[PDB]
C-alpha cells in the first residue's frame, strides 16, 4: 500500500500531526504505540514479566511500570535477550496485522528513533513534522522530564534538522495555532489521497 513516512526529530510533536491524519481515516502503524499495546493490563507478556521479576512490574492500575522494568534491564543486562524473545514476535505479529487490517487509501509510517536503513525502503514519500530547536529542547525537556542539557545531547545525536528537512518531500511545521496545523495535514493528506490514486493506475 502507499506509504507516507512521518518524521521528526525528538520534541516535534509528531505524534500529534499523526492523530491528526488518524481523524481522517488514515492507519497510522507506530512501533511505540504497539509496543505499548503488548505489554498491556491483562496481557500474557506483562504477566511473563512480572512473574520472572516481580509484582513491582505491575501498577496499581494493571500496566507496566515503565521505570522498574528499565532498572531491571539496566541492573541485568543479560535479560535483554529475554525480554526480546518475548516481546519480538508479540511486536512483529502485532505490526502485520495492523497493516493487514487497514483498509485507508494509504498508510501513515511514523518513523522511529533509530533510522538504519533508507526511509524509501518502506514509503513512497517522506513528511517531516519540524519546528526551531528551542521548541525541540523545550517539548523533549516536558515529555522526557530531562534537562536542558540532557535535551541538548540527544538533539545533537540525531539526524540534523537541515538533514531531515533536505531529505524531505514535504515539510509541516508543528507550530502556531492547532486549527492552522490542521488545516495543513488536511492539504496533504488530499496530495496523498491523489498520489495514491496516481500509484495505483
Ligand atoms: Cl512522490
Given amino acids: 500500500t502507499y506509504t507516507v513516512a512521518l518524521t521528526g526529530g525528538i520534541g516535534s510533536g509528531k505524534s500529534t500531526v499523526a492523530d491528526e491524519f488518524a481523524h481522517l481515516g488514515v492507519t497510522v502503524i507506530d512501533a511505540d504505540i504497539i509496543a505499548r499495546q503488548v505489554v498491556e493490563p491483562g496481557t500474557p507478556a506483562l504477566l511473563a514479566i512480572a512473574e520472572r521479576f516481580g509484582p513491582q512490574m505491575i501498577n496499581d492500575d494493571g500496566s507496566l511500570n515503565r521505570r522498574r522494568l528499565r532498572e531491571r534491564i539496566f541492573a541485568h543486562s543479560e535479560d535483554k535477550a529475554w525480554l526480546n524473545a518475548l516481546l519480538h514476535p508479540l511486536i512483529q505479529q502485532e505490526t502485520r496485522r495492523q497493516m493487514q487490517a487497514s483498509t485507508s487509501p494509504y498508510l501513515l509510517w511514523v518513523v522511529?528513533?533509530?533510522?538504519?536503513?533508507?526511509?524509501?525502503?518502506?514509503?513512497?514519500?517522506?513528511?517531516?513534522?519540524?519546528?526551531?530547536?528551542?521548541?525541540?529542547?523545550?517539548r523533549t525537556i516536558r515529555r522526557d522530564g530531562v534537562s536542558r542539557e540532557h535535551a541538548e545531547?540527544?538533539?545533537?545525536?540525531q539526524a540534523t534538522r537541515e538533514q531531515r528537512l533536505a531529505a524531505a518531500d514535504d515539510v509541516i511545521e508543528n507550530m502556531g495555532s492547532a486549527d492552522a496545523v490542521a488545516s495543513h495535514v488536511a492539504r496533504l493528506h488530499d496530495?496523498?489521497?491523489?498520489?495514491?490514486?496516481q500509484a495505483a493506475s
Avoid at 545531547?153 to 545525536?157: E, G, N, P, Q, R
Avoid at 496530495?191 to 490514486?197: D, E, G, N, R, V
Fill in 112 to 138: 522511529p528513533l533509530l533510522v538504519e536503513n533508507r526511509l524509501t525502503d518502506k514509503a513512497d514519500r517522506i513528511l517531516v513534522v519540524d519546528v526551531p530547536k528551542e521548541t525541540q529542547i523545550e
Fill in 191 to 197: 496530495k496523498y489521497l491523489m498520489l495514491a490514486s
Fill in 153 to 157: 545531547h540527544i538533539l545533537a545525536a
